[model samples]
Target chain A: FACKTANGTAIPIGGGSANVYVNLAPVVNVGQNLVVDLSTQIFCHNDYPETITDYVTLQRGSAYGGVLSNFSGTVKYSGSSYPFPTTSETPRVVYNSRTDKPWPVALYLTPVSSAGGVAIKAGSLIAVLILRQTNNYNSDDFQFVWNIYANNDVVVPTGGCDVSARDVTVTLPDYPGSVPIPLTVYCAKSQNLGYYLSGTTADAGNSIFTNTASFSPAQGVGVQLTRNGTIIPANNTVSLGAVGTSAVSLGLTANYARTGGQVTAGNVQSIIGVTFVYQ
Target chain B: DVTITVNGKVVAKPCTVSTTNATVDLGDLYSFSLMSAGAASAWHDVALELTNCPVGTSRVTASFSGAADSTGYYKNQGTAQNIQLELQDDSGNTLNTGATKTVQVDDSSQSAHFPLQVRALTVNGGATQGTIQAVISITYTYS
Candidate 1:
């Protein structure tokens, strides 16, 4: 989905257009299944002696996109969904390879079967979305990309999306049907990547990026996700040399790293399909 | 005995007696002579008169000379004296004191002492008596 920056400007994904979609009627029956895929790029560059983490969230509502239910997802960064310990304290990361670079994280949503029963009644669907960043880096990060889809169709503006990339899917279900539901995504990081991505190299600039969206389910199926990242420094010490002088070493170096490799995101996505077969 | 002269003259009673009980018979006459005594001799003359007096019927007179005895004894034969008479009633009340008649004593009497004679005159046996009694009078004198 093409989510707006904080300044009301469009934010594009890397090598792709920024767009969001919503489908009200999916060709499915009751007791069927659907999935939602959400993708995004995140860039961080900073030289401070610290790491950074960010969060992505989804929500659903009927009239005004109230709250999300049964949403599940994982964040993939540098080829894996890195999980961290759920705590209010800083995460600790150890470097196994010096060449592992920081990358954008992806999140997914599982269709909720219980929500499909509630979505059979009109005025009962829900959709909601929001994104936030918690940077542990000492500098700012700059580029970000994101996309949202359902059943492989791109829901367009004015027909698929509300203000702020808010979308809804409306569909009824047969007694038993299956459908590949789509995912909604939101990506955001610091716009000053020179400082956020280059950990321990320079100080990040003072700026923040945020994306927020809402959705409604036609059959009461919805989803939600949370994405997090941690960046640690490479070494404990480094050297600095003046022009034509001998190099002097400093003991305290910055660590930019991620803490874990397990996905910590929950199933906040739900799907509801109704059965109208009367015996 | 003293020898006294005896004049041998005629001594005789009267040739014949004559008398009257009306002393003065004339109404107009006041005096009548009965007797006359001679002057200065021893001779007796007795006279009587009637007077018309206003208060009483009495004849009273006084004489100047008369004879009396030193031994209370005297006799006169020829001297003249007065003899007076007075008459009153028995109760000493006067019948008349000459209120209707004047009775007078004759002035020819020279005797100082005389015997008073009073009589009841009888005319034809009717008697008219004069009063004869002594009367005592008490006199009072205040200085």
Candidate 2:
């Protein structure tokens, strides 16, 4: 099938592949699942062949070959779902499309729409693939390769990242009203890392996190986050150091600071989100 | 991205009060000892004990509060004339009524001991004492 732009510019039928980077927590427990959705549209001129049928499928790779259940979800098209491949040998056939070897299922064709031939007006819906983490996944770095085939020929390509265990809890000791008390320290070991830190809750300026809710006694206190004695503001990032080969240590520290007035006896808590952008 | 949550409680009483009630025996005060103004008996030492304190508690304060006399000393509630009770810290600093003294808590033991002294003093020149006795209440505060 010949494809063209709206302005009559001829284009190739097979699109290019894209790689998405998803950074996960440095530590994730077993049995944890993360989901990422990759939605894309396939645009072609309306004058193109409307009677043609395209199949959305996943190519078998050596990374996760035998573990088909680990990457199990549906490739959606026109409000219908086609379950992804769950075995390396036999591929399941959904619609009345061709049943070739171990890949490719009919995504959309002429019969799904109207009698005069499925209209490809403007930018028609192509595929919406849902990549979910099943129970058998245990990789910090995973790759899922998928592509669309038009009449048993590769047409479009797409992929994305899935990050699980995004939440981390740091429990502080019972603090007494005094100088700024030090909390538990955290360290992320990596080679050439740029740690971008930000607060996820209300703060008292200068990277000091305020209480989630007003305490009964109104403790005039806040929590402060720091890296090697340097203050990291609540809403800003402080970048430091150049990239290196050996694994560097990104050490973090937090403290309970007495903002002003008397820090009465009550509960004090704060939250900070850290993102590591590295090479 | 990773989220970190810091949690803790600001405690008013970090240390357990070991000695809630104490009896300071200022035994056998003769009338001649308090005959002249500014005269006082020997000081009696008592320890306000605190135990099982956490490392966060750096210091402890002991505030004195009770019935005070015109001379800023504790008034003798018993049948004693021209006599008052004087309280002082271990360093001899006068801990008059409504006065407070702070002592550093030992980090190793996580405990504190406020060694205090109490004595009987004469307010007037001519003194006639009958069972000189006074009660002083100590309130423990911490940081």
Candidate 3:
């Protein structure tokens, strides 16, 4: 096409249509940010910020890709087919004109699930949601997801598998100390490590910790270990169970007893290891 | 691994709001029209606008709030003595500190406009001369 100038000279008219192509189907990505700590499932209007990475791209049909555009959508979490964050949230989108990239869409979220103030439980199976986009394009299905899970498995409390339980010193009146006083001391003898393994030695009762020094004047006396109240026979190993859903608790008492005697007042300090067996 | 899952109706999303710095100029006014008496400057109109709102967004509300000075008025922050800031909806109703006004956003991805007024409350001859400024923030929550 041509246009005429004041002097009647023909200037070519520039006008044409550019073809555009879209993703076979637009994909709505609510990356890892969407799955939050169940703790945030508090009162009405606890807004959580989420990112929406859209996979819906556009091509200027054959020649050059078209200008990327904006997308918009509403989300709902169902208690059944899906777990909650169930509040209906609308996410907004825009194009980053400068970088020619899709401006990150913010999914301003509020937990809508009101289970009578129940805890926001997590670590559920992945829920697949069909995101149907009707914005700036024909209706197409997009998949979005919610991720939740337990972060760690059962293990003893931190600060090393080995720990000092308690140390007791008693000055009694007579030989053999009359009755043996009990002292409880330990460093985990039975260890159950989880996936995130650290270089920690597993507890092996007796085998790992033995040999107690006797007190002077008392001639022969030492600390003895008992599991389930039974003398864990000398030269045997303590059996610790497998790591489970919760941390293992080992409770063994130290029976401070005397073998040979000439009852004299004295003190014997012992730093010992007690292998822990879990139920 | 912790799982992060999402489920939503993305086809037609709800409207989110946007705005640039909004200010109301209650220009120069006389303080000595009378002394020790309460007076007010003529009202100045301002608009709190919304952008890129969604189709299902049935209603929009803006809650206004700010700090109040001794005279029970929104306190001015820029050294404008004795003058207080006050806001009102288009209907002339006090949209004072912590007050809310609502309107429905029309369907289709579009913008909504809200007209508001900020008037200066004065204690005649009580204010020292200086630039008057007060910040009145609005929270636009749409559902």
Candidate 4:
């Protein structure tokens, strides 16, 4: 798979496209699910082989299938570990991918596990997407064009960054966090790496990804991996001394964290797994 | 895992009241124009109209009730004797019954116009026609 941004860059699927305006704020009731943000510091890069899993599907081009849960169907994950989707009726189409040509194939993928299995690692998974409004719209209602592939076919990897590759994807930069209005403002990013080879074992307390996607307003929000400013406390590791290889560059900064309750908006993922302590 | 697609919109539903139930005639006068005391008769406009407004709506307030006549104006119930019912706004000012007027909405026709006026007064004069009437009642208040 391929999708990057966390200091690896590259995430181009033909211009990408995102118009989104669903604020709807009037207290945001009536079925309630306005969560915006079509994209933000993404980062998808997997190799897969814990036993062959792979998933991440979507196609949709027809235009308007409408399904925001009335009951039955399921498929929406990224928080609470996962909840079968509170009652997903599945069917969030909305088309116009340049005249609809061909699109409507997302039989299912991602968010499997329970036996159906879906293991693929190197982190990146978030899809709550439910769209259903029915009537009461005014400016440019829907426009659709989301493609995103990678199911079983496989064969699209060739990305860059791989110091030794255990896990390292630190993309951050988009903070407004002063909070006001439905609330959502903080987003930080900082990176500086030179050419290292010695002392380094900073896990900074890793273990922050939780978006099981049920009601997902970014379920509890996570991301706080600073190092020069302090706070690495997740799994706890910290140690970067011995510089014996030639230069030494490592700044790292990611903060935008919240533990739970009231963040409002959606899609936020975190994975700061690291391990490299060569002396 | 990566999936992204979003193109949606919504922002239109804060106004659309274009004058609800209006009927301000005021014509047919003649009893010597209301026979003197405080006599008065010509204004007549009346518009409430709001229509389509939603740029987040800027301003609008109407508020007027009824039955006051001590010289406070509005209270003719119709038989027409002393003839009361004055109201004003095009800057003439006196609304008096509960009064309130505010305006400002047209940011390129998001629309809103209060322009009001009514007449047929005679604070304490002779006045005695046959049919004048006065009911009043408006209450808008917007953002």
Give candidate 1 regions above 4 Å deviation: A1-67, A70-103, A114-279, B1-143
Estimate, for each residue in A5-105, the C-alpha lDDT of model 3 and write its tens digit.
12122222232111111111112122211322121221111111132222222111111011101111223222212212223323433221222222122
- Number of the top candidate by DockQ? 2
Query: Tens digits of per-residue lDDT for model 3 on B1-143?
Result: 11111111112244555666875565566766524666666777777567775333445677777888666667777866656666666565766677777775554435688887766666645777788766666665644
DockQ of each: 0.00, 0.28, 0.00, 0.01
CAPRI accuracy category, model 1: incorrect
Instruction: Give the lowest summed-lDDT range of ten residues in model 2 chain A.
Output: A109-118
Model 4, A48-110: lDDT tens digits are 324332233333222222221222222222311212333323333332222212222222222
Name the docking class for model 3: incorrect
Over A153-263, each residue of candidate 2 has an lDDT whose tens digit, in order, gives 111111121122234556666653223322222222222334555654454355555676456533666776666667766545445555332333455665667665434
lDDT of residue B1 for candidate 1? 7
| Cα lDDT computed for each candidate against the true fold | 0.24, 0.46, 0.37, 0.40
Lowest lDDT sum, 10 consecutive residues, model 3 chain A, at A60-69
- Give the TM-scores of the predictions, in the order they appear: 0.17, 0.41, 0.30, 0.22
lDDT of 1 by residue, B1-143 (tens): 00111010111111111222323121221112322332111222334333222211123332222233232212223232232223332234332222122223232331112222223221122212232222211121111
Poorly placed runs, candidate 3 (over 4 Å): A1-279, B1-18, B34-36
